[PDB]
Design a protein around this ligand. Structure first.
Ligand SMILES: O=C(O)CN(CCN(CC(=O)O)CC(=O)O)CC(=O)O
Ligand SMILES: O=C(O)CN(CCN(CC(=O)O)CC(=O)O)CC(=O)O
Ligand SMILES: O=C(O)CN(CCN(CC(=O)O)CC(=O)O)CC(=O)O
Ligand SMILES: O=C(O)CN(CCN(CC(=O)O)CC(=O)O)CC(=O)O
Ligand SMILES: O=C(O)CN(CCN(CC(=O)O)CC(=O)O)CC(=O)O
Ligand SMILES: O=C(O)CN(CCN(CC(=O)O)CC(=O)O)CC(=O)O
Lengths: 77, 77, 77, 77, 77, 77, 77, 77, 77, 77, 77, 77
């Protein structure tokens, strides 16, 4: 008993964007106070914690387009 | 008993956007106070915690289009 | 019993972006106060912690387009 | 029982971006105060900690396009 | 029982970016105060810690495009 | 039982960038104060620590494009 | 015609206060935003204006007793 | 016509205060944002203006008692 | 016509205060942002202006008692 | 017509304060941002202006008692 | 017409203060950013201006008592 | 017409202060950034200006008591 598997999807997709003029952006975070109290921290795995943070992010990409594609083929017996 | 599987979807999709003029944006966060109290933290797996945070994010992408595509083929016996 | 597996997806996708003029961006974080108290920290795995941070990030890429593609083929008996 | 596996995906994708004029960017972080208290730290694995930080990052790449591609083929018996 | 595995993906991808004029960037971090107290630190593995830091980074690459590609073939018996 | 493995991926990818004029960049870090107190430090592995640092980095590469490629073939019995 | 005026009030008053233990007071103002727009301001006299203010005052005097006494004698012809 | 005026008030008043223990006071102002716009300011007299202020005052006097006494005698013809 | 004026008030007042223990006071102002715009300022008299200020004052006097006394005698013809 | 004026007030007042132990005071101003814009400033008199200031004052006098006394005698014809 | 004026007030006042132990004071100003823009400044009188200042003052006098006394006698015809 | 004026106030006042132990004082100003722009400055009188200053003052006098006394006698015809 033979098995024949042919896997070939075809992607011609396009992600584009056109913006004429981009600017004049003002980010003015006016302070703040953060206090966090903990005592015992145990992490044992893929762990992405974040504790006690006061962050400001200005993100202005001219583009910013994002394409994510995953191809998974599993042959098991 | 032979089995024949042919897998080839075809994608010609497009994601686009046009914007003439983009700007004149004002983000003014006026402070704030955050207090969090905990004592024992145990994380053991894929864990994405976040505790005690005062964050401001200004995100102004000229584009920002997003395409996500996943192809999964599972052959099991 | 022979098995034949042919794996060849074809990608002609494009991610593009055009922006005429990009600028005039003002990021003015106005201070802040962060206090975090912990006593015992044990991490034993892939762990990406971050504790007690006051960070400001200005990210202005002219492009910023991102393409992520993963091909995984698993043949098991 | 012979097994034949042919693996050859074809990538002609392109990531591009065109920006005419990029500049006039002002990053003015206005101070801040961070205090963090801990006593016992044990890390035994791939661990990427970061504790008690006041950082400012200005990132202005003319390009900034990013392409990530992984090909994994596993043949097990 | 013979096994034949042929592995040859083909990459013609391109990552490009054009920027006419890039400049006029002002980074003015206005001070700050960081205090961190810890007593016992044990790291025994691939560990990338960072403790008690006040850093400012101005990163302005004319290009900045990044391509990451990994090919892993595992044949096990 | 003979096994034949042929491994030859083909890379014609290009990473490029063109920038006309790049300059007029001002980095003015305005001081700061950092104090860190620890008593016992034991590191026994590949360890990349960094403690108590006030650093300023101005990085302005005309190019800055980065390509990373890894080919790993493992034949085990 | 003679006039005789004798002015001598006598004050033996006392203002006192006894407090055993005074403390454990927490003032935590959680931010706020104030905007005031005016164009023409003319003040010509004893004037005690105050415009556009975000103030926090913690006043904890151990005593705080206040005595105000005014003696005015006017002889006119 | 003779006039005789005798002016001698007598003050034996006392202002006192006792406080045993005074302390454990926490003032934590959590930021804030103030913007005030004016164009023309004319002050011509005893004038005590104050415009556009974000102030925090912690006042903890052990005593704090205040006595104000004014004696005014006016003889006019 | 003779006039006789005798002016001699007598002050034996006392202002006192006793405080046993005074301390353990925490003032932590958490940042803030102040912007004030004006164009024309004319002051011509005793004028005590103050414009655009972000001030923090910690005032902890062990005493702090205040006595103000004014004696004014006016003889006019 | 003779005039006799005798001016001799008598002051035996006392201002005192006792404090046993004074200390353990923490002043931690956490940054801040102040911007003030003006164009024309004319002051012609006793004028005590102050513009665009970010000041922190820690005032801890062991005593701090204040006595102000003014004696004014005006004889006019 | 003779005039007799006798001016001799008598001051036996005392200002005192006793403090046992004074200390353990921490002043930690955490940075800040001040920008002030003006163009034309004309001062012609007793003028005490101050523009664009970021100052920190720690004032801890063991005493600090202050006595101000003014005697003014004006005889006019 | 003779005039007799006798001026002799008597001052036996005392200003004193005792402090047992004074010390353990920490002043740690954490940086800061000040920019001031002006173009035309004309001062013609007793003028005490101060422009564009980042100063830190630690003032710890063991005494610090201050007495100010002014005697002004004006005889005019
Ligand atoms: O096919 C469409 O619907 C629109 N076309 C043309 C879009 N534009 C062309 C351009 O922007 O250069 C025509 C237009 O905007 O009128 C896109 C394509 O063929 O991929
Ligand atoms: O095919 C398309 O949809 C657009 N073309 C042409 C895009 N441009 C050409 C250029 O920018 O040099 C045409 C245009 O912008 O009108 C891209 C391609 O063939 O790869
Ligand atoms: O093929 C494309 O899509 C664009 N070409 C041409 C791009 N340029 C040529 C140049 O910059 O010298 C044409 C253009 O910018 O109009 C690149 C290539 O063939 O590798
Ligand atoms: O007269 C009164 O009413 C109270 N006395 C005495 C108050 N105290 C004396 C002290 O505190 O030393 C007595 C008490 O508190 O029982 C005050 C005075 O005579 O001036
Ligand atoms: O007269 C009073 O009311 C209190 N006395 C005495 C206050 N004390 C004396 C001291 O502190 O040395 C007595 C006490 O506190 O019990 C003050 C004075 O006569 O000037
Ligand atoms: O008269 C008073 O009220 C207190 N005395 C005495 C104060 N002290 C004396 C000293 O400190 O040496 C007495 C005391 O503290 O008990 C001061 C004076 O006569 O000038």
């Amino acid at each position: 008993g033979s098995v024949q598997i042919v896997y070939k999807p075809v992607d011609l997709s396009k992600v584009t964007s056109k913006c004429g003029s981009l600017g004049n952006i003002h980010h003015k975070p006016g302070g703040g106070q953060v206090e966090v109290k903990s005592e015992k921290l145990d992490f044992k795995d893929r762990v992405q914690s974040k504790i006690g943070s006061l962050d400001n992010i200005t993100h202005v990409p001219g583009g910013g387009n994002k394409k994510i594609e995953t191809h998974k083929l599993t042959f098991r017996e």
